Amino acid sequence: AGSEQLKCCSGILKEMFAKKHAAYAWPFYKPVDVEALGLHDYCDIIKHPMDMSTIKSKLEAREYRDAQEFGADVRLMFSNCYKYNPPDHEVVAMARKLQDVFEMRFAKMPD
């Protein structure tokens, strides 16, 4: 189970990285660039940054004990975006579309 579910988790992240979703997924591919103009306060507000490449790397290094831990990191990524940005920000609408994908796949995972 633990084993089968984490393989499903890898599949979910793979879909999140797919061309199908790239139009709204791309801001989450790599760590937020805290050096860029506009993001000088990012680390004041976000104590635990997370992004898809870091999650992919965590899966591959077997750093998740179960699907729950994988799921917590994906949701951390989304919550960081909701926390940092104004709710009318374009990146927030992108996060929701990507989260729709994750939540639906994560929920439909066999048990």
């Binding site: 801001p27 860029a36 103009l37 940005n85 990146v91």
Partner: peptide, 5 residues
């Protein structure tokens, strides 16, 4: 705003 280009 910039991060979403």
């Amino acid at each position: 705003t910039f991060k979403s280009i």
